[PDB]
RNA sequence: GUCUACGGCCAUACCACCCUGAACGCGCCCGAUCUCGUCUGAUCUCGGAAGCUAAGCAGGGUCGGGCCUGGUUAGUACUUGGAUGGGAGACCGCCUGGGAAUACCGGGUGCUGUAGGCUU
RNA sequence: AGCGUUCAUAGCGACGUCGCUUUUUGAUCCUUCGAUGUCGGCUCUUCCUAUCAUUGUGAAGCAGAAUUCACCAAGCGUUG
RNA sequence: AAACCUCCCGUGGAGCAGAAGGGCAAAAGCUCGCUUGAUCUUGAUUUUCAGUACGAAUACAGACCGUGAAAGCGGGGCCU
RNA sequence: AUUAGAGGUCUUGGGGCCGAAACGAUCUCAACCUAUUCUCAAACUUUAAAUGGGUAAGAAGCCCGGCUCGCUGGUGUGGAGCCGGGCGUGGAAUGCGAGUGCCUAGUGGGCCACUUUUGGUAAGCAGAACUGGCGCUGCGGGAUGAACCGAACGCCGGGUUAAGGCGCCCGAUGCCGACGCUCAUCAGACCCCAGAAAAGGUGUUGGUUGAUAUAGACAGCAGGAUGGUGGCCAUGGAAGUCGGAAUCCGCUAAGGAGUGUGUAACAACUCACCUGCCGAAUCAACUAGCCCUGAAAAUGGAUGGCGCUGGAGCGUCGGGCCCAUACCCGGCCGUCGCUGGCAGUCGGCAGAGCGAGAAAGAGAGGGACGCUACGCCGCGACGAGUAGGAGGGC
C-alpha cells in the first residue's frame, strides 16, 4: 500500500514552471484579501511554509480570517460521499484572486445600469442571459464564383 | 486462505443513494478560528455600540425627513384584443350588454 | 453509412461559419451517394473534415438538394473510382458498370464490392463517378454488350412460382 | 442560396429501456422527463439543451416535429399535469384553469405556443405530461445503432414525423 | 524625444559582436586627513572634481543564436460515447463529439507607474 | 546459410520464426475433507494413429540384397 | 594528471547530515560576528481520519528573549 | 540510453614512416570538438490533449447615510461591527416539494463484463480503476446456460414491438425477393462462444502496376540463318562453336566477328534475328475475396437435429411476416398520493345550488340511497425481491 506522507505524489504539482524558478514576484505579496473574497488555491514549492495540503491544490474557497502572512479559507472537500466545508490556513504565496466571480460582478453593473437606464425611456431591455439560440435564416451570396467540387483523394501508401 | 485486499467498487453507488449533499449553508457563520486580537477588539466595538445611540436616532430622524421633503417636492391585431376585452369576466360586463339587445 | 435500398445522389454545398476575420468563407460542393438526405449531410461532413479543417460545429449546409438523372431512359457505361479497405491495407480500384442512373450504378457497386471483396459500405470511399463512352470502357464484362446486333436466348429457365401448384401432376418444363 | 433558420423545436423519444444505464445518462434522461421507453416530449433547442441530447444520443431518437405531428400528439395523446395528476385534456377549461395567466385558453393556443416556440414555451411544455406513445407499428431498423448508420437512435431531423405517425 | 531615483510585469528585456551618443545625468576617474575596512584605499567606507566617453549605461545594426507570437505539421496522433462492426489474433474501420506536439516557414525584439531633470 | 566429393531441399538442415498435442512435469485452486479406497503388477475388453510388422503404392546418393523418406491405412499382430 | 597563486568562461551541471523527489544564487550554499525562538502558556486548524487519538505540521494570540541600523526574522533542522 | 558516417585541430595519445632530433613534414589510427544522422524511456522532459476536478451565475445582492472600537494609524486613516434608508425584469437552460432528528436490523467471504491496467509464457490465474450487471431476478432471444443481447414482473382481454428470427422440428418469406461469390474424397453456416497459424495454390473471382500488339500480337507449324572474314594479339592445330583484350558495314524483311551438343581444325546444324498462315490480348510481377493444402487422440457424435449446393452457405440489401411479463388502450385487485370530497338527510318554520379560466356576498337596510366519520366516496400515479425492517390479519 502507499505511504501517507504529506507531500506524496506532488513531484509535479508543487514544482515551479519551466524557467520560472527563483525569487517570487513581489506583486503576489502586495495583494489585499478582504473577508469573503473568493480565492483559488495553488501550492507553490518555492515557499515551504504554510503550504496547503495537496488535496486543495486547484480548489477554490472563500476567505474568512486574515493574519499577518496568511489567510483562513473555507474550502469544500469531498470525503467519501459527504462534502466538508473545512478551514485551512495558507500563506499568501499559494493564493490567487479568483476571476470566476468577477464576470458576475461585471454583469451586475450593466444589469443595474440598464435598469435605471431605459426605465425612464420605458424600453424593456432583456437582462437574463440566454443560451446560444438557433441561428437565423439568411441568404448566402455566390456572386460570380461557383462552389468548387470536393472529391476524396486516392490512397497511396505513405511508408 | 487469502481474500480481496481493497476495492471501491460499489462505493460511488452507495454514496449517491442519499445524495452527496453540500454542507448546510447559513448566513451568520461562526467566528471560531478568527485572529484573537481582531476578535478581542471586535467585541469591544459591540460593548460600546450603545454609547452612540442618541446620535443614531437623531441622525436617523433627519435622514427620513431628508427624503421626506424630497419626494414631496416632486409629489397583435385589434380584432383579437377587442374580443378579449369582451371576453373578460369583470371589465367586459358593460361590453357584452349590447348582445342582450342583439337577439331582441 | 449502410447502403440500404437504392442510393440517391445528393448535391450538398456548405461552408465555414462567417467569422469577423473572414466575412464570407468559400463554398464547398460535393456529390454524395446516400440512402436519404440526412445521412448525406453526415457523410458530407465526413469528407469535408478529411480535405479541410472543417467540422459540423464550425460549418453549415447552405443547400441539400437531390440531383436527378438527366437521361433515365438511356443505357450508359459508368466508371467508378473507389478507396475501399481490406482486412489488410487499403486499395484504389476502378470499377465499371452499365446502368440507367448514376445512383443505380453506384448501388450496383456497393453490392458488388460487398460480394466480391466482402467490403462493407462503411469502408468504401467512392471518389469519382464518370459516365464513359462505350469505346473507352476497359472491363470486358461490360464491353461484351457493345453490339448493335446483340442476340442470345434464355437457356435454362429456372421455374418460378414453384409453390402455386405445390403438389402438381405434370413435371415442369424448363424449355421455352 | 437561402439557408433556412435552423429549427427551434425538437421532439425526443426514449427508445431504450431502463436496465443497465450509465449514471450520467440516467440523470439527463429524467431531466427530459423520459423515464419510460417510448416516452416522448418536446424540447426547445439551444446550445444548452442540444449538448444534453448529445449525452443520451444512444438512448433517444429525436428530430424536428412537423405541424401536423404537433396536432396529432396534443390532440390524441395530450394529457395535462393538473395538481400533479395526469388528467386528459378533454375541454378547454382544463387548460385555461392552469395556463390562463399566459393567455393560453384553448388547445390551439397551446399548440401555437408549442409549435412556434413562444415566450411561455417552458410553462406550456411543462404543463403537458410526457407523451406515452405506443411501440412503433411497422418495427424499427435497429434500436442499438445511430440513425445515419442504419439504426434508429440519434437525430433523424425531419424523418421523426414518419416515426410519430407509427408510434402515435 | 531622453535620462536619473524607486519600481511593476520578469528575455519581445537574454547572449555575441559592431556603430553612434547634443544637453543634463549616471559613470569612469583623483585622493586617504577624518569615518570605516582590507595581505593590498582593488573591493568596502570616506574627501574630492584635473581628465575622459575608452568602458559601463542608452540607442541602433546582424539573411545573428535565443526568446515571444503565428503558419505548417493536421482534422494527423490521441480521445468521450456507440454497434450482434471487421479480424484466429495483434489490431483496424465507422458512428457521435473533442482535438495535439517537433522538424520546416513567417513576423516581432521590451511595455509601463510614481517623482525629478535635460533637450532651457 | 550450410552438410551431403560435386549438387540448398535423396536424406539432412544452422541463425530465426509459426503451430499442434495433453501419454511429461509445472502453474492455478473451480469441484470433493458428515471420505470418490491413495504405487505397481496380474486379469480382461475397447478405442486412438503420431505405422514397428503385414497389404497396396510413390521417392532415393534404389544394380541386386539390405536399408532409408513419404502416401492410403489401425484389418491383424507386437512375445519368452 | 594532480600542492599553491592569477585571470577568464561558468543557470547551478555544486552544496544544503541521510533515501528519493521538490526547492534554493547579493541564497536555503560557503565564511565570519553575536547568540539560545530547540524557552514559558492558552485555545484554533491541517495531515491519517471514524473525520477518534498519537505523531508531525500550519496560522495566530499572550509572555520573555535573540539578532539586525532597520523593516523584520526566529518558538529547532529548506519541505516531504 | 544509443547507430552511423562527415568536417576540424595536434587538443593529446597509440606503431611508425625521411627525420640524431624538431606541433617541420609524412600517411596515418584513435579519442576530442563542431555540424548533422538512426533509435528509445513506468520511476526523463520543453510542449501537451480528450475525458475530468473546483468555484461563480444576486435579496444571505447591490447602493447611499450615520454611529461603535481598547484593533490599525501622516490623515473620521485602514478594517471590522453595528444601526437607518432605497432599490424585485427573482437576473443562464432543464427538471423536481424540501429540510431535519431520533431509534435501528442485516452486512463487513463476493463474483462477472466493456474500456484502462499490474504480476505472469499463459490460465475459467492473481491484483486494481471506472460504470453496469449477477448475487437479491423472473421473462423474450443466444439449442443448452448465475453474468451475453432485448427487457425488468400485481391479475387479465385486444393491439404493437425489442433483441432475435421466418426449409421441417418450430410461431413467421408457400416473397415469381435483388446483385454477386463459392464445390470442399475435412465445405460452410451469426455477439459473448466454445476451436487454429506461419507458409502455399497455373482452383476461381476481382483489382494494381509494368511491358508487347493491326509499320500485325503470344502459343503452334516451316523456311533464310550469311558477305568483307578462314578477323586482329594467340597456341603443333581452333575458321562464331576451347579461354580473354576488341567488337563495324554492304546485299537486306534478317543473321551476333556469336547461345548448347562434338572432332587436331575443318564439313554440317541450330540459336539470337526475319518472313507465310491462323487473327485477336497476350506476357510478367503483385494484391485481395471465397475454396483448398498446412490440419494428429483416444466410448459413437454433433452449424441444436434432420438436412441443405438455381442454398436452408457467404457478402451486400429490400419488402412482408412471427412474439416478451416491454410499450399502447380497456377491465379488476392492492399500495401510495391528493395531508382530496362528505356533518347540507339545511323540507308548507320547506324551495331542491356552488364544474366556476380570472383577489372576494345567490348578504341585510308529499320528496330513493346515505354518514359501523376507525365510515363512505372521487380522482391520479404506481406494483421484482434474498438478508433485513414494518404494517394489517372477520
From Swiss-Prot, chain A:
Residues 111-144 are annotated as: Disordered. One of its GO terms (cellular component) is ribonucleoprotein complex. Component of the large ribosomal subunit. It is found in: Cytoplasm, Cytosol; Cytoplasm; Endoplasmic reticulum. Keywords: Cytoplasm, Endoplasmic reticulum, Ribonucleoprotein, Ribosomal protein. Component of the large ribosomal subunit. The ribosome is a large ribonucleoprotein complex responsible for the synthesis of proteins in the cell. The keyword Ribonucleoprotein applies. The keyword Cell inner membrane does not apply. GO terms for molecular function: structural constituent of ribosome. PANTHER family: 60S RIBOSOMAL PROTEIN L21 (PTHR20981). InterPro entries: Ribosomal_eL21 (IPR001147), Ribosomal_eL21_CS (IPR018259), Ribosomal_eL21_sf (IPR036948), Translation_prot_SH3-like_sf (IPR008991). Residues 111-122, 135-144 have a biased composition (Basic and acidic residues). This is Large ribosomal subunit protein eL21. Its main location: cytoplasm. It holds the Pfam family Ribosomal_L21e. Gene3D superfamilies: 6.10.250.3260, Ribosomal protein L21. Belongs to the eukaryotic ribosomal protein eL21 family. It comes from Oryctolagus cuniculus (Rabbit). One of its GO terms (biological process) is translation.
Curated annotation (Swiss-Prot), chain B:
One of its GO terms (biological process) is cytoplasmic translation. The keyword Phosphoprotein applies. The modification Phosphoserine is found at residue 30. The modification N6-methyllysine is found at residue 4. One of its GO terms (cellular component) is cytosolic large ribosomal subunit. Residues 1-32 are annotated as: Disordered. Keywords: Acetylation, Cytoplasm, Methylation, Phosphoprotein, Repeat, Ribonucleoprotein, Ribosomal protein. Component of the large ribosomal subunit. Belongs to the eukaryotic ribosomal protein eL29 family. Component of the large ribosomal subunit. The ribosome is a large ribonucleoprotein complex responsible for the synthesis of proteins in the cell. This is Large ribosomal subunit protein eL29. It comes from Oryctolagus cuniculus. The chain holds residues 2 to 117 of 245 of the full protein.
Swiss-Prot record, chain C:
Gene3D superfamilies: 3.10.20.10. The modification Phosphotyrosine is found at residue 63. Component of the large ribosomal subunit. Binds IPO9 with high affinity. GO terms for biological process: translation. HAMAP family: Ribosomal_eL20. This is Large ribosomal subunit protein eL20. Disulfide bonds: none annotated. Component of the large ribosomal subunit. The ribosome is a large ribonucleoprotein complex responsible for the synthesis of proteins in the cell. Pfam families: Ribosomal_L18A (PF01775). Coiled coil: none annotated. The keyword Ribosomal protein applies. Keywords: Cytoplasm, Isopeptide bond, Phosphoprotein, Ribonucleoprotein, Ribosomal protein, Ubl conjugation. There is a cross-link at residues 11, 128, 170 (Glycyl lysine isopeptide (Lys-Gly) (interchain with G-Cter in SUMO2)). InterPro entries: Ribosomal_eL20, Ribosomal_eL20_dom, Ribosomal_eL20_eukaryotes. It comes from the Eukaryota. Belongs to the eukaryotic ribosomal protein eL20 family. The modification Phosphoserine is found at residues 71, 123. One of its GO terms (cellular component) is ribonucleoprotein complex. It is found in: Cytoplasm. The modification N6-succinyllysine is found at residue 76. GO terms for molecular function: structural constituent of ribosome.
From Swiss-Prot, chain D:
Keywords: Acetylation, Cytoplasm, Phosphoprotein, Repeat, Ribonucleoprotein, Ribosomal protein, RNA-binding. Coiled coil: none annotated. The keyword Ribosomal protein applies. It comes from the Eukaryota. The modification N6-acetyllysine is found at residue 44. GO terms for cellular component: cytosolic large ribosomal subunit. GO terms for molecular function: RNA binding; structural constituent of ribosome. The modification N6-succinyllysine is found at residue 47. It is found in: Cytoplasm. The modification Phosphotyrosine is found at residue 59. One of its GO terms (biological process) is maturation of LSU-rRNA from tricistronic rRNA transcript (SSU-rRNA, 5.8S rRNA, LSU-rRNA). Component of the large ribosomal subunit. The ribosome is a large ribonucleoprotein complex responsible for the synthesis of proteins in the cell. Binds to G-rich structures in 28S rRNA and in mRNAs. Plays a regulatory role in the translation apparatus; inhibits cell-free translation of mRNAs. Component of the large ribosomal subunit. Homodimer. Interacts with DHX33. Belongs to the universal ribosomal protein uL30 family. This is Large ribosomal subunit protein uL30. It comes from Oryctolagus cuniculus. The lineage of its organism: Eukaryota, Metazoa, Chordata, Craniata, Vertebrata. The gene is RPL7. The chain holds residues 41 to 208 of 208 of the full protein.
Amino acid at each position: 500500500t502507499n505511504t501517507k506522507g504529506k507531500r506524496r505524489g506532488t513531484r509535479y504539482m508543487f514544482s515551479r514552471p519551466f524557467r520560472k524558478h527563483g525569487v517570487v514576484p513581489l506583486a503576489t505579496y502586495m495583494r489585499i484579501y478582504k473577508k469573503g473574497d473568493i480565492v483559488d488555491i495553488k501550492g507553490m514549492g518555492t515557499v515551504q511554509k504554510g503550504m496547503p495540503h495537496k488535496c486543495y491544490h486547484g480548489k477554490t474557497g472563500r476567505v474568512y480570517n486574515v493574519t499577518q502572512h496568511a489567510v483562513g479559507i473555507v474550502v469544500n472537500k469531498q470525503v467519501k460521499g459527504k462534502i466538508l466545508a473545512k478551514r485551512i490556513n495558507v500563506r499568501i504565496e499559494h493564493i490567487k484572486h479568483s476571476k470566476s466571480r468577477d464576470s458576475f460582478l461585471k454583469r451586475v453593473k450593466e444589469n443595474d445600469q440598464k435598469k435605471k437606464e431605459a426605465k425612464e425611456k420605458g424600453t424593456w431591455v432583456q437582462l437574463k442571459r440566454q443560451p446560444a439560440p438557433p441561428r437565423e435564416a439568411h441568404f448566402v451570396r455566390t456572386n460570380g464564383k461557383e462552389p468548387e467540387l470536393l472529391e476524396p483523394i486516392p490512397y497511396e501508401f505513405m511508408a | 486462505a487469502k481474500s480481496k485486499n481493497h476495492t471501491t467498487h460499489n462505493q460511488s453507488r452507495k454514496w449517491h443513494r442519499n445524495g452527496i449533499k453540500k454542507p448546510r449553508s447559513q448566513r451568520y457563520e461562526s467566528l471560531k478560528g478568527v485572529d484573537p486580537k481582531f476578535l478581542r477588539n471586535m467585541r469591544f466595538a459591540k460593548k460600546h455600540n450603545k454609547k452612540g445611540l442618541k446620535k443614531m436616532q437623531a441622525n436617523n430622524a433627519k435622514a427620513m425627513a431628508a427624503r421626506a421633503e424630497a419626494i414631496k417636492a416632486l409629489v397583435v391585431s385589434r380584432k383579437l384584443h377587442r374580443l378579449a376585452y369582451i371576453a373578460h369576466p369583470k371589465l367586459g360586463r358593460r361590453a357584452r350588454a349590447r348582445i342582450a339587445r342583439g337577439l331582441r | 453509412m449502410k447502403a440500404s435500398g437504392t442510393l440517391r445522389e445528393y448535391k450538398v454545398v456548405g461552408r465555414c461559419l462567417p467569422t469577423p476575420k473572414c466575412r464570407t468563407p468559400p463554398l464547398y460542393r460535393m456529390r454524395i451517394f446516400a440512402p436519404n438526405h440526412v445521412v448525406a449531410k453526415s457523410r458530407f461532413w465526413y469528407f469535408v473534415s478529411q480535405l479541410k479543417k472543417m467540422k459540423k460545429s464550425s460549418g453549415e449546409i447552405v443547400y441539400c438538394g437531390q440531383v436527378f438523372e438527366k437521361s433515365p431512359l438511356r443505357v450508359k457505361n459508368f466508371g467508378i473510382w473507389l478507396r475501399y479497405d481490406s482486412r489488410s491495407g487499403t486499395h484504389n480500384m476502378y470499377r465499371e458498370y452499365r446502368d440507367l442512373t448514376t445512383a443505380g450504378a453506384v448501388t450496383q457497386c456497393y453490392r458488388d464490392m460487398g460480394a466480391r471483396h466482402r467490403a462493407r459500405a462503411h469502408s468504401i470511399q467512392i471518389m469519382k463517378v464518370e459516365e464513359i463512352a462505350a469505346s473507352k470502357c476497359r472491363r470486358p464484362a461490360v464491353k461484351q454488350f457493345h453490339d448493335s446486333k446483340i442476340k442470345f436466348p434464355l437457356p435454362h429457365r429456372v421455374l418460378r412460382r414453384q409453390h402455386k401448384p405445390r403438389f402438381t401432376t405434370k413435371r415442369p418444363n424448363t424449355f421455352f | 442560396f437561402y439557408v433556412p433558420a435552423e429549427p427551434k423545436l425538437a421532439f425526443v423519444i426514449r427508445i431504450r429501456g431502463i436496465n443497465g444505464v450509465s449514471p450520467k445518462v440516467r440523470k439527463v434522461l429524467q431531466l427530459l422527463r423520459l423515464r419510460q421507453i417510448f416516452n416522448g416530449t418536446f424540447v426547445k433547442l439551444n446550445k444548452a439543451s442540444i449538448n444534453m441530447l448529445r449525452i443520451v444520443e444512444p438512448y433517444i431518437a429525436w428530430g424536428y416535429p412537423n405541424l401536423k405531428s404537433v396536432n396529432e400528439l396534443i390532440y390524441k395523446r395530450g394529457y395535462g399535469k393538473i395538481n400533479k395528476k395526469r388528467i386528459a385534456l378533454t375541454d378547454n377549461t382544463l387548460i385555461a384553469r392552469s395556463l390562463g395567466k399566459y393567455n393560453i385558453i384553448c388547445m390551439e393556443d397551446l399548440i401555437h405556443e408549442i409549435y412556434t416556440v413562444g415566450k411561455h414555451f417552458k410553462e406550456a411544455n411543462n404543463f403537458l405530461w410526457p407523451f406515452k406513445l405506443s411501440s412503433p407499428r411497422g418495427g424499427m431498423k435497429k434500436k442499438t445503432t445511430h440513425f445515419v448508420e442504419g439504426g434508429d437512435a440519434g437525430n433523424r431531423e425531419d424523418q421523426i414525423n414518419r416515426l410519430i405517425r407509427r408510434m402515435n
